[PDB]
Amino acid sequence: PHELESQFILRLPPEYASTVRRAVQSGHVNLKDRLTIELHPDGRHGIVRVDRVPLASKLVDLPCVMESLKTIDKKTFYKTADICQMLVSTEKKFIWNHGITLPLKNVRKRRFRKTAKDVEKEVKRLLSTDAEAVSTRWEIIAED
Amino acid sequence: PWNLSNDEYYYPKIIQHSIPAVELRQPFFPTHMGPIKLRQFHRPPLKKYSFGALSQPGPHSVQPLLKHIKKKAKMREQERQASGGGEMFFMRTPQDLTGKDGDLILAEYSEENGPLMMQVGMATKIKNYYKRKPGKDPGAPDCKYGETVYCHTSPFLGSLHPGQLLQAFENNLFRAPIYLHKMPETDFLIIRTRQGYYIRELVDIFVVGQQCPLFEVPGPNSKRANTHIRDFLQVFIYRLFWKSKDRPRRIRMEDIKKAFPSHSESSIRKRLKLCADFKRTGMDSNWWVLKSDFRLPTEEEIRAMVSPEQCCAYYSMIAAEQRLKDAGDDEVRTAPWNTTRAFIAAMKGKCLLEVTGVADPTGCGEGFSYVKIPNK
Amino acid sequence: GFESPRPYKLTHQVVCINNINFQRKSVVGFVELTIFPTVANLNRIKLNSKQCRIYRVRINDLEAAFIYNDPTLEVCHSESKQRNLNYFSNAYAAAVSAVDPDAGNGELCIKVPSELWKHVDELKVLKIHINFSLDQPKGGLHFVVPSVEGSMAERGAHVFSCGYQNSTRFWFPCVDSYSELCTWKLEFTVDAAMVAVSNGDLVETVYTHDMRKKTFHYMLTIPTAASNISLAIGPFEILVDPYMHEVTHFCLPQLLPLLKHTTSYLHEVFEFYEEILTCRYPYSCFKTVFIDEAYVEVAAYASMSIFSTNLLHSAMIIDETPLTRRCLAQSLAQQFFGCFISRMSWSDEWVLKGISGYIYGLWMKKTFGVNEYRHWIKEELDKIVAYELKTGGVLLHPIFNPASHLHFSIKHPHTLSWEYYSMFQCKAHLVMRLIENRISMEFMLQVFNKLLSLASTASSQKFQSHMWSQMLVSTSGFLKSISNVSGKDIQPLIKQWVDQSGVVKFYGSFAFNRKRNVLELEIKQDYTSPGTQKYVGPLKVTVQELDGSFNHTLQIEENSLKHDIPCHSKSRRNKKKKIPLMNGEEVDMDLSAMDADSPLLWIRIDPDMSVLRKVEFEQADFMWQYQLRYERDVVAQQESILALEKFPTPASRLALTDILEQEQCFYRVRMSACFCLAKIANSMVSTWTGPPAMKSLFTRMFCCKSCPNIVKTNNFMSFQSYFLQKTMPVAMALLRDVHNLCPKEVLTFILDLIKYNDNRKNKFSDNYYRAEMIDALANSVTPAVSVNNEVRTLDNLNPDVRLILEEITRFLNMEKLLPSYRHTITVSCLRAIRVLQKNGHVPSDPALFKSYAEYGHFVDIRIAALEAVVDYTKVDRSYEELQWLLNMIQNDPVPYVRHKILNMLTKNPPFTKNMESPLCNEALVDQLWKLMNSGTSHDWRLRCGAVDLYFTLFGLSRPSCLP
Numbered sequence A: 001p002h003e004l005e006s007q008f009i010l011r012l013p014p015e016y017a018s019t020v021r022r023a024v025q026s027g028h029v030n031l032k033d034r035l036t037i038e039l040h041p042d043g044r045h046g047i048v049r050v051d052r053v054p055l056a057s058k059l060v061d062l063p064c065v066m067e068s069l070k071t072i073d074k075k076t077f078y079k080t081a082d083i084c085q086m087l088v089s090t091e092k093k094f095i096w097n098h099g100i101t102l103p104l105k106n107v108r109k110r111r112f113r114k115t116a117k118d119v120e121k122e123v124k125r126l127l128s129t130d131a132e133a134v135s136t137r138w139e140i141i142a143e144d
Numbered sequence B: 001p002w003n004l005s006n007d008e009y010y011y012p013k014i015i016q017h018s019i020p021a022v023e024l025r026q027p028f029f030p031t032h033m034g035p036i037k038l039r040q041f042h043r044p045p046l047k048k049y050s051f052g053a054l055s056q057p058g059p060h061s062v063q064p065l066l067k068h069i070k071k072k073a074k075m076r077e078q079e080r081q082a083s084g085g086g087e088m089f090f091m092r093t094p095q096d097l098t099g100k101d102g103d104l105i106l107a108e109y110s111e112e113n114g115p116l117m118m119q120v121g122m123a124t125k126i127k128n129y130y131k132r133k134p135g136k137d138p139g140a141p142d143c144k145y146g147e148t149v150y151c152h153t154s155p156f157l158g159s160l161h162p163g164q165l166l167q168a169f170e171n172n173l174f175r176a177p178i179y180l181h182k183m184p185e186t187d188f189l190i191i192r193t194r195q196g197y198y199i200r201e202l203v204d205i206f207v208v209g210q211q212c213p214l215f216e217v218p219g220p221n222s223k224r225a226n227t228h229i230r231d232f233l234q235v236f237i238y239r240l241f242w243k244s245k246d247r248p249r250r251i252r253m254e255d256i257k258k259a260f261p262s263h264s265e266s267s268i269r270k271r272l273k274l275c276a277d278f279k280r281t282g283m284d285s286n287w288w289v290l291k292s293d294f295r296l297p298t299e300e301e302i303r304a305m306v307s308p309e310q311c312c313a314y315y316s317m318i319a320a321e322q323r324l325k326d327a328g329d330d331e332v333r334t335a336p337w338n339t340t341r342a343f344i345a346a347m348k349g350k351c352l353l354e355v356t357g358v359a360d361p362t363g364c365g366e367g368f369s370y371v372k373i374p375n376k
Numbered sequence C: 001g002f003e004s005p006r007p008y009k010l011t012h013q014v015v016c017i018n019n020i021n022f023q024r025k026s027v028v029g030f031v032e033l034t035i036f037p038t039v040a041n042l043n044r045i046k047l048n049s050k051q052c053r054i055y056r057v058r059i060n061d062l063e064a065a066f067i068y069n070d071p072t073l074e075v076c077h078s079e080s081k082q083r084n085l086n087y088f089s090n091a092y093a094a095a096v097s098a099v100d101p102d103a104g105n106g107e108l109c110i111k112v113p114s115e116l117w118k119h120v121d122e123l124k125v126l127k128i129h130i131n132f133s134l135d136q137p138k139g140g141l142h143f144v145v146p147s148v149e150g151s152m153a154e155r156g157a158h159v160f161s162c163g164y165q166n167s168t169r170f171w172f173p174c175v176d177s178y179s180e181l182c183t184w185k186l187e188f189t190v191d192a193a194m195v196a197v198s199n200g201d202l203v204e205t206v207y208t209h210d211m212r213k214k215t216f217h218y219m220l221t222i223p224t225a226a227s228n229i230s231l232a233i234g235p236f237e238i239l240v241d242p243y244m245h246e247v248t249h250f251c252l253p254q255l256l257p258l259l260k261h262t263t264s265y266l267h268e269v270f271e272f273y274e275e276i277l278t279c280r281y282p283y284s285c286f287k288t289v290f291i292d293e294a295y296v297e298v299a300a301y302a303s304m305s306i307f308s309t310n311l312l313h314s315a316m317i318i319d320e321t322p323l324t325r326r327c328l329a330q331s332l333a334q335q336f337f338g339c340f341i342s343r344m345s346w347s348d349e350w351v352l353k354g355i356s357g358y359i360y361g362l363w364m365k366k367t368f369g370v371n372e373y374r375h376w377i378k379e380e381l382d383k384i385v386a387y388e389l390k391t392g393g394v395l396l397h398p399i400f401n402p403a404s405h406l407h408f409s410i411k412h413p414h415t416l417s418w419e420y421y422s423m424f425q426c427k428a429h430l431v432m433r434l435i436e437n438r439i440s441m442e443f444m445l446q447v448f449n450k451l452l453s454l455a456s457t458a459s460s461q462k463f464q465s466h467m468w469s470q471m472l473v474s475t476s477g478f479l480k481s482i483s484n485v486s487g488k489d490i491q492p493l494i495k496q497w498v499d500q501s502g503v504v505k506f507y508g509s510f511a512f513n514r515k516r517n518v519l520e521l522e523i524k525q526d527y528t529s530p531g532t533q534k535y536v537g538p539l540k541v542t543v544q545e546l547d548g549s550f551n552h553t554l555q556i557e558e559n560s561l562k563h564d565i566p567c568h569s570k571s572r573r574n575k576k577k578k579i580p581l582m583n584g585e586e587v588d589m590d591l592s593a594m595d596a597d598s599p600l601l602w603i604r605i606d607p608d609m610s611v612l613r614k615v616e617f618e619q620a621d622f623m624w625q626y627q628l629r630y631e632r633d634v635v636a637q638q639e640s641i642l643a644l645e646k647f648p649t650p651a652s653r654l655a656l657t658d659i660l661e662q663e664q665c666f667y668r669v670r671m672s673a674c675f676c677l678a679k680i681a682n683s684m685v686s687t688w689t690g691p692p693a694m695k696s697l698f699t700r701m702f703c704c705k706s707c708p709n710i711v712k713t714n715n716f717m718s719f720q721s722y723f724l725q726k727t728m729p730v731a732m733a734l735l736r737d738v739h740n741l742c743p744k745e746v747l748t749f750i751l752d753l754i755k756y757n758d759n760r761k762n763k764f765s766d767n768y769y770r771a772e773m774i775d776a777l778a779n780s781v782t783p784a785v786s787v788n789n790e791v792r793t794l795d796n797l798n799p800d801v802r803l804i805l806e807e808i809t810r811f812l813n814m815e816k817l818l819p820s821y822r823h824t825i826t827v828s829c830l831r832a833i834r835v836l837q838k839n840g841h842v843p844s845d846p847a848l849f850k851s852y853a854e855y856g857h858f859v860d861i862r863i864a865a866l867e868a869v870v871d872y873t874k875v876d877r878s879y880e881e882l883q884w885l886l887n888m889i890q891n892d893p894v895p896y897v898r899h900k901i902l903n904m905l906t907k908n909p910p911f912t913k914n915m916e917s918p919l920c921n922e923a924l925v926d927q928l929w930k931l932m933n934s935g936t937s938h939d940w941r942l943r944c945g946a947v948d949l950y951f952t953l954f955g956l957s958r959p960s961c962l963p
Helices: A014-026 A030-034 A107-111 A119-132 B035-039 B067-082 B223-242 B253-259 B265-273 B299-305 B308-326 B336-348 C085-098 C114-120 C256-262 C266-276 C321-340 C349-390 C418-438 C441-458 C475-486 C491-497 C621-630 C634-646 C650-660 C667-683 C695-701 C721-732 C744-755 C767-779 C799-817 C824-838 C847-852 C859-875 C879-890 C895-907 C922-933 C942-954
Strands: A006-011 A035-039 A046-050 A053-071 A076-089 B060-064 B105-109 B123-130 B147-149 B165-170 B174-182 B187-192 B197-201 B204-208 B276-279 B287-290 C008-021 C026-037 C045-047 C053-059 C065-068 C108-111 C126-134 C141-144 C158-161 C182-191 C195-198 C201-207 C213-224 C231-234 C237-240 C247-251 C286-291 C298-301 C304-308 C504-513 C518-525 C538-545 C548-555 C562-566 C600-605 C613-618
Touching: A006 A053, A014 A030, A014 A046, A014 B187, A014 B197, A030 A035, A030 B060, A046 A076, A053 A107, A076 B187, B035 B308, B165 B204, B223 B253, B223 B265, B223 B299, B223 B308, B253 B265, B265 B276, B308 B336, C045 C126, C053 C065, C053 C108, C085 C922, C085 C942, C114 C126, C158 C286, C182 C195, C182 C231, C195 C213, C231 C286, C237 C256, C247 C256, C247 C266, C266 C321, C266 C349, C286 C321, C298 C321, C304 C321, C321 C349, C321 C441, C349 C418, C349 C441, C349 C475, C349 C613, C349 C634, C418 C441, C418 C491, C418 C942, C441 C475, C504 C600, C518 C538, C518 C600, C548 C562, C600 C613, C600 C621, C621 C634, C621 C650, C634 C650, C634 C667, C650 C667, C667 C721, C695 C721, C695 C744, C721 C744, C721 C767, C744 C767, C744 C799, C767 C799, C767 C824, C799 C824, C824 C847, C824 C859, C847 C859, C859 C879, C859 C895, C879 C895, C879 C922, C895 C942, C922 C942
Parallel strands: A006 A076, B060 B197, B105 B204, B123 B147, C008 C182, C247 C286, C286 C304, C504 C613
Antiparallel strands: A006 B187, A035 A046, A035 B060, A046 A053, A053 A076, A053 B105, A076 B123, B123 B165, B165 B174, B174 B204, B187 B197, B276 B287, C008 C026, C026 C126, C045 C108, C053 C126, C065 C108, C141 C158, C158 C231, C182 C213, C195 C231, C201 C213, C237 C247, C298 C304, C504 C518, C518 C562, C538 C548, C538 C600
């Protein structure tokens, strides 16, 4: 079978980003030894090791949706993957408010329309507790 | 000795997706999306592997892929020059749609949930609309990507200024103004697969403005909606019959029940009633063999049954159904069936749209709202 | 991948021609080939040669021994008593396959000398120097030598290479296949007052030491086949094209102004074919030669085309400008895709013929309009469905018999019937239009550009065919290039319309369900006829209802019969609103004839002609009248005209009369509505109210306002009312009264059209209009009432026919003093005299037509007179006229006339196989078997015509009228 590839964006500190960029544009396999990525079983924490120097990482959710688009002639572009996550290196904490481009900053707060009426999972847990019970008493309340 | 065909009285006045996309192959075009997969629609989380090299916990080296990129580009140029030198069609396999080769750009979206959105494997074009200056003009400011076209009649809602070039994504689904920005100096692109991590740099990232929809998303329980569900199930059944190696072509029912688990089995048996029959005893027992008089449709007929853009419109409808369902009339107006109907009706000139409203995907004065207002 | 059937590869060929003697009709020359053996122990080398006397052959300047035998000279033995045609077809196919260069074979077998075997085993070059002589050629080179005295340039004598396909073996020894590409060096030593035109570019022209002869040196660096090499030697008037400067036009003397006017359009044809394809013209020059007594009307070779002089017209000649224009266009299309990109086998010929015909149709679309394109495509499709339902079918791309339903073998081009060759090219370009319908036109032009670009990168290498075989296209390579540019493969369409040899027949009938508002179509196929096949694909149908025009796709599987499609509202009959058409416009329709319960106005099954089909739809007559009036498609207007002949109601007369009065209708629809109105008027006699049909309309459109019976003076500058004016009396003469005689109101009208004709004021000639007037006079002739077989003399002539006979006598005699453009009035008057002889008016005497069929007349007069003699010997069962025609087939100077006599005697045979006739002797069977076996051994087109004549007369089995 075929499994859709999973692309994400890696953001590094600027000096380490310059060393990683120089090693990528060089093209040797020396970069392979220099750059490693260890993702912790939390799922939202990691180490990126640049030149064997550990950096602390967080995998965050991006507010917009990006899409990688490949081309052969630079006139027709084929969508290859959807990017929604970034492993910035240096829950509410795992949500990034800004977008990658310069015009998109504070997009989640300002350029996103918010419509409102985790919570569903809590309601399911409450229903399960009511089922495991015997007698349930309920009242919409006031200030108390 | 001349034309002599009164042609002015008789006659008074393109996107090629990949072969995995036009054949609706199941990684790229899913048969069924559950609730947690509809909430993560076009935002796929980073899954943990169970088997593979990355499934073992620990540090993992990323691998540079610049010999791979230039080897694949040189190989594709050899293929193109061996085929006569014209423009070629290359995306014929799923392994052509990897990010490991070709010139990648990124495309960011301004809206959170657009009315239409491309699946993986589908093609789009970049058109540079350039309105000439009044009288003399130097020529279109040249651009790295896309082809230039001179637009007297603005494609979008507004009109282009004289001497203004605007790039845009153009396909069958939408048309949307894009804006080229340079990448941040810190961000790279990591393509992870089961075997390891791979790293590219990116240099070009477009910002996609508010989409102008060219395809109408159907409503829930619509006639077009139920027709697409039935035709998608029929196409999947035909492609399972084509994949069958048995000389009387035969399929199993629980393959279809694995693909479409929300379907009642009466509908699946309705699709299998014509074109198949159930064998209970003897050979082919508990199989749905193909009827001997039934001609299984060819590949182009199956492609003419369902289009990929209809699948994208259906996925937009069911994702918006989930988001509305989770959030308990203003929200209903912002549903893509309403907004796509409003915009396409405004483009024929049926009705007008209030450009300031609640269907505004920004939530501020920027951006349009596609909801119908009477022309009076 | 191309692997040669020959064990050698030919690199270069020198063709030198000396001593072209026009008095003795003789050439002398040599040929030097440069072959590289690919297999060791080559021993014999087999070359192609017909009619050339081989003097000596030297291989690497060593004397070699050759043996010559041609099995196609006498196909079957003289002392075999077989007389069936299947025996001759198998023996003729085996004989042509025994001289085939597409196998390893050939007619001249040269033995390599012994001392060169150590030169041939380790594969080194061999230079074969044959010198030959054509003593008095019966094929290949045609010598047109007139019998005026003077020098050969002063009398207008010329030579040209004639023939079709691989016929270059007829004038020098070669490897006469389309797959043996080599570079060429061509020298011709001609008279000092003559010019030698050939392929390549002329590098120099040196004089001889007496300065009485000069040698033309041509060089061809683009590797062409031997079959694309031509020659035209004559006293030609040279004209350089004033727009494109590598193009030279050669004409016969005294025809330079006609050449200037005629070849003035060709730069636009060049510009079209170089902008739809993106390759420039591949050869370095282009030469158009106009000659007399041509083989075909247009032949295309490498960097050269040979047309007949009968295409040359002046500025005041209309009705000939489009025909000559499209002959030039198809010669240039074959320059691109028959001569530069060549054929890999005899299969894959459909690819080249289809690409040539398809890009020529694109030229016709741009030049003459989309409506003329649709009319041309419909007439080609009707041609092929008529031919394939008549006899078997045309099989593009056979696999090697594959087609055993037809009396010849399709393995070689020289065994094909000529009608099969014509229908082959026709079906090839229609199947290419179908491939454009599946895969869009821009991808199609990209396929053609990829083929041309591979060929032009191949054309500049020097490697001897390591890369020169990329200039040869195949079917698999063409389908692979299509799959490369588009990603779709056309293998079901290729399997249906190429590999399978049949057309489809559709019988449709509808019924409107008022309750559920649906339209129940009923489409059934006739798949048991001999020419037919079964269609299982999708099918487009276009329904015009009151809400507009809607397209529907129907899936027509084998067990399908009823197709229910949905119908829209009828709210445009509640309010008067305009009904929107197939294009964006909308019109006011008179809905009084429509049914009250059905919204649908007309239905068209397969409107875009997307299959090779013959549709028989059963509409109601008002639906045919609405489709004639308000449709924006010319093929639907033509098919509604064709279907209105079965409904002679006065509403159909009103529909055709409204079509005739209507400018902004396509003119070829009105020209058909004339004949349809004539047929309808003949069928509703004793109901017709006023004057005869189209007469008042003719006086309203083309006569004076103050005088109705005087026609306006001729001004032919509109070109659509000219064609309608010259076609309306021809249809008006088919009117008949209750007594079955043409009325004296229409005959008097035609005679007044003839008398009051004044042409001193237009800038165009009157020959076609006057010729059509003679055709209208011939249409009015009804059979005479002979009593007791009374001899037809001058006193018992019809009083109607005496006026007609006086007019055609005046016209023919005035043509003898003031001739027309191509003796069009001679052809029309001979045709009218044959019409008067076919009825009992003029005595049935063939002596006039036998005097007009002599050699010195123009070729149009000759073929009209020979058509009259063929019709006479069919009706009068004349033995001596049939012997006259068979003698004229055997020894006539013009081979086109011989082919035309065999063609006309096949189309209008003196007897068929079913008839008992007095002309069914053993003597006639022996004459026609001798004409198939020997006698026609020099042309390859007379022999297939003799096979067709023997099939038409005696059938596939043993001639019955025999011991």
